RNA sequence: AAAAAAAAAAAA
């Protein structure tokens, strides 16, 4: 199906917090004001 | 703080270990683990 | 006095060489190997 | 990576990689070609390892699939089209593939080995393998010329036999020949050489789009808008380009 | 396009390769000018 | 979020480097004097 | 004599050929030292490669692998490079900025893995009169370059020795007061004014103008 | 046209923030 | 330390 790429990242995406548990993927992801660059967070604090 | 504590699931892999007790020869021939690992292996 | 409804425009689009066959044409997959898609039209401002 | 396996390794979207920092170096001296990754630390811009990058076997295969495809596809016996199919093909793998490409040895020998079955197929078209039937001139030639135009990964050789030509003029026959008395001969250029590195276009980018963000903040700051003129040295320059 | 102007000149030049073909059997005067149709009239004739 | 590929503003190969990059810039992430470990398992979702 | 000079230009094209059709950059040079030479030509074979890296978009590290194993070879291709660098730093104003980014990362490549001497350095004449705006730009690009390479740690270590003093005080200039102050603003305006830390106006007595 | 200035300035930032990844933060 | 017929062009 044409919309079958975003149906499918969506559905990625919640098994994505079943993988990860959703604090670290709110850490990962950061916030929504502010939301983190691809593989960077705020501070080496969160990282760790 | 421990790390596996805000998971959803738990031992969801509990019982996976267990293939391979006795080899099962099946006198079917699309239903046995030999056609299943050929059609997962080559349709995709 | 009725104007009608507009329509869309599609969303932009030695000489020579020896022929690939008029069946073998297909659909024209060969356009150009040396750089990929169509002519890109660009503008001088921004 | 441990404590006495100083290699980190995974594969990604193509690439096979194996990080080693520059702390744990045995290696006194390194052997840094295109393929290798100075992987900079940006808390003090140092360069402190190397991503030795290679193509996956799996994606050799692919490519060679992909020639197989080819060569059993419904306009494979037109040397036209075969040629045309060669060179997308050709030119898909290495420029999606770079520096990788470059330093893996299976995949070259895929590729010369691929082209030897594209031009056997256009020998086979003409009923002849003879190798002094067709020089690199029939393979190799613009179709501008008339040639078919493939492109070459590939090291190949043009003899000094086919680099003569004679002309007649008012006086007679006069026998021209390029290259005078040059024991070493041409060789067919390699569609390696005429693509610019990953890594390259990342710093070249990553420059590009910074003295473009300057001029930009610059520009609206005088209340100028902005040209083509001011962006003419960074005009096929950045990912995605200017 | 530096690769189709370095294959021209690592075949030794336009000279040699038309050398090599049946240039000169068509008697035209100079190379620059000549242009190749794709399909023939019967061919493009021929097509459905 | 960020981890959600395939993305528009990257190609694979700039993900790769990008992938490189980060391991790089992970606090000290090469350290591994006092015992530490770095894990990178790649791995797909069967039958999703 | 030959006014159309087939040697040279031949010979240009068969280094640019081999150069062209090469994937390793160790092919190349393998390649190029099997070319049969008449006795001596290597000048002409320093400058076909060093405008091969000129003509590159972006430059590579197949042409500073290319310039370096003709560097690690013997003597005199190594001092024929460093002719080939000052004949380059003489004449950088005929060169675009991409192409003089180009110059200064294979010089750069070719000085930090110490594949040609730390003494031709001494070329680099730190003046408002013989340093152009192009050359402040090939100075600022090769030593970010030799920064990039080996290190900040590294910069300081090497060049605070005793014995490049001498080769260089066209750099480390400590004679007039008002070219350490060009030298110190330059380097900082450059993000590179941690170096500068022997250049010290201060105890200058000779040139106290202001108390 | 105003809606276009502004849906086309919109393609200069997307483009900015897909050249800017990682730079930015 | 150096590898060059047929399909397939149809029974007064």
Redesign the pocket.
């Known amino acids: 199906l044409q919309f079958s790429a975003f149906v499918f990242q969506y559905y990625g995406l919640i098994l994505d917090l079943l993988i990860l548990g959703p604090q670290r993927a709110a850490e990962i992801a950061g916030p929504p004001q502010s939301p983190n660059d691809f593989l960077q967070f705020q501070d080496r604090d969160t990282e760790t | 703080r421990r790390w596996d504590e805000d998971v959803v699931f738990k031992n969801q892999a509990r019982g996976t270990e267990d293939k391979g007790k006795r080899k099962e020869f099946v006198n079917d021939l699309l239903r046995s683990d030999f056609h299943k690992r050929f059609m997962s292996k080559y349709v995709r | 006095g009725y104007a009608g409804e507009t329509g869309l425009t599609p969303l932009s689009k030695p000489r020579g060489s020896i022929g690939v066959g008029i069946l073998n044409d297909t659909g024209s997959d060969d356009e150009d190997p040396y750089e990929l898609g169509p002519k890109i039209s660009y503008n001088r401002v921004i | 990576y441990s404590k006495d396996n100083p290699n980190l390794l995974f594969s990604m979207c193509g690439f096979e990689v194996r990080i080693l920092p520059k702390c744990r170096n045995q290696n006194d001296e390194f052997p840094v070609k295109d393929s290798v990754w100075s992987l900079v630390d940006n808390s003090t811009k140092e360069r402190t390892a190397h991503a030795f990058l290679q193509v996956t076997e799996e994606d050799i295969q692919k490519f060679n699939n992909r020639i197989r495809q080819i060569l059993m596809s419904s306009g494979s016996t037109t040397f036209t089209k075969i040629a045309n199919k060669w060179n997308t093909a050709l030119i898909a793998l290495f420029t999606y593939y770079r520096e990788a490409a470059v330093s893996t040895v299976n995949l070259l020998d895929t590729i010369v080995k691929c082209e030897?079955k594209i031009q056997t197929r256009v020998k086979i078209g003409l009923?002849?393998?003879?190798?002094?039937?067709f020089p690199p001139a029939v393979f190799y030639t613009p179709k501008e010329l008339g040639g078919l135009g493939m492109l070459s990964g590939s090291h190949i050789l043009i003899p000094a036999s086919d680099k003569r030509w004679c002309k007649q003029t008012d006086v007679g026959i006069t026998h021209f020949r390029a290259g005078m008395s040059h024991d070493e001969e041409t060789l067919i250029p390699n569609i390696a050489r005429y693509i610019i590195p990953w890594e390259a276009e990342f710093i070249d980018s990553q420059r590009v789009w910074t003295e473009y963000s300057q001029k930009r903040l610059e520009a609206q700051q005088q209340n100028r808008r902005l040209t083509l003129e001011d962006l003419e040295d960074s005009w096929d320059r950045g990912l995605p380009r200017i | 396009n530096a690769y189709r102007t370095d294959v021209i000149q690592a075949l030794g030049g336009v000279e040699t390769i038309l050398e090599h073909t049946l240039f000169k059997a068509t008697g035209f005067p100079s190379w620059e000018g000549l242009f190749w149709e794709k399909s023939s009239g019967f061919e493009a004739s021929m097509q459905f | 979020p960020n981890w959600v590929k395939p993305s528009d503003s990257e190609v694979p190969p700039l993900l790769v480097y990008k992938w490189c990059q980060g391991i790089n810039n992970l606090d000290k992430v090469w350290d591994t004097s006092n015992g530490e470990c770095n894990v990178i398992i790649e791995t797909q979702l069967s039958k999703v | 004599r030959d006014q159309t000079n087939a040697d040279l230009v031949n010979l240009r094209r068969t280094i640019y050929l081999t150069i062209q059709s090469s994937a390793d950059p160790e092919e190349a040079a393998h390649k190029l030292m099997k070319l049969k030479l008449p006795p001596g030509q290597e000048p002409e074979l320093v400058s076909m490669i060093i405008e091969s890296c000129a003509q590159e978009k972006v430059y590579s590290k197949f042409m500073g692998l290319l310039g370096e194993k003709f560097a690690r070879l013997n003597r005199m291709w190594m001092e024929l490079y460093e002719e080939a660098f000052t004949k380059y730093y003489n004449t950088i104003h005929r060169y675009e900025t991409n192409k003089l980014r180009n110059i200064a990362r294979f010089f750069g490549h070719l000085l930090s893995y110490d594949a040609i001497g730390w003494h031709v350095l001494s070329v680099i004449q730190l003046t408002e009169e013989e340093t152009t705006a192009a050359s402040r730009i090939f100075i600022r690009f090769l030593f970010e370059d030799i920064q990039e390479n080996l290190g900040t740690a590294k910069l300081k270590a090497r060049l605070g020795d005793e014995a490049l003093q001498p080769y260089l005080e066209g750099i480390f200039r400590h004679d007039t007061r008002r070219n350490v102050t060009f030298a110190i603003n330059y380097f900082t305006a450059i993000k590179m004014g941690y170096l500068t830390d022997e250049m010290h106006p201060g105890r200058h007595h000779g040139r106290g103008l202001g108390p | 046209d105003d809606s276009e200035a502004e849906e086309r300035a919109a393609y200069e930032e997307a483009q900015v923030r897909a050249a800017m990844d990682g730079l930015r933060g």
């Open positions: 030897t009923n002849s393998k003879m190798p002094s039937r």
